[PDB]
């Protein structure tokens, strides 16, 4: 809440795009994995192509 004006998350790599950490510092994937909880695994997480 105090760093939404400082940092924005980029899920770019297979090791470094993870939805457990991305849903913390981004309130868009925090809704996306709220609607698709099976995406919370690091292997099946959707990332921008």
């Amino acid at each position: 809440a105090v760093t939404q004006c400082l940092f924005h998350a980029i899920p770019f790599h297979m090791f470094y795009g993870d939805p457990r950490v991305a849903a913390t510092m981004h309130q868009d994937v925090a809704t996306f994995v709220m609607r698709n909880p099976q995406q919370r695994a690091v292997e099946a997480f959707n990332r921008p192509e």
């Binding site: 939805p19 457990r20 849903a23 913390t24 994937v29 925090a30 809704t31 994995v33 709220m34 909880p37 919370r40």
Partner: protein, 49 residues
Amino acid sequence: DFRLHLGPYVDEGHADVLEKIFYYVFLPTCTNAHMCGLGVDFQHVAQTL
């Protein structure tokens, strides 16, 4: 009364799963289900405070 004095719904990346996973795994194993729910009278505790 038939009204629910309830706080507003907030969102997370889990959709209530951590609440229920705590209250239905961690407490009944660790406490051996030695708990009972209670009720409070808020005016009484405020008049004490």
